[PDB]
Ligand binder design. Structure first.
Ligand SMILES: Oc1ccc(/C=C/c2cc(O)cc(O)c2)cc1
Ligand SMILES: [Ca+2]
Ligand SMILES: [Ca+2]
Length: 72
């Protein structure tokens, strides 16, 4: 996990490559590419499951908090 919502905020606002307020599946798979992201298509949805348990296709800061517990 990060430190608190001070650093967590930038991980959400500065990571949205689409620029709309909510991170989507396309930006998540393109964000971890700098630190790894070398897996199959199911692994892309692995993090999306905890970030978006509804699977609607959009991640908000409220759901971002719930994901930090699964991604650690
Ligand atoms: O919906 C998501 C929200 C956040 C993340 C972040 C993952 C992650 C994990 C790390 O150890 C370092 C990092 O810079 C990013 C992945 C999916
Ligand atoms: Ca987005
Ligand atoms: Ca969602």
């Amino acid at each position: 996990m990060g430190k608190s919502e001070e650093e967590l905020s930038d991980l959400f606002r500065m990571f949205d490559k689409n620029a709309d307020g909510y991170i989507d599946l396309d930006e998540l798979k393109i964000m971890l590419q700098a630190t790894g992201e070398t897996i199959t298509e199911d692994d892309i949805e692995e993090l999306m499951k905890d970030g978006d348990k509804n699977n609607d296709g959009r991640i908000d800061y409220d759901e971002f908090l719930e994901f930090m517990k699964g991604v650690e």
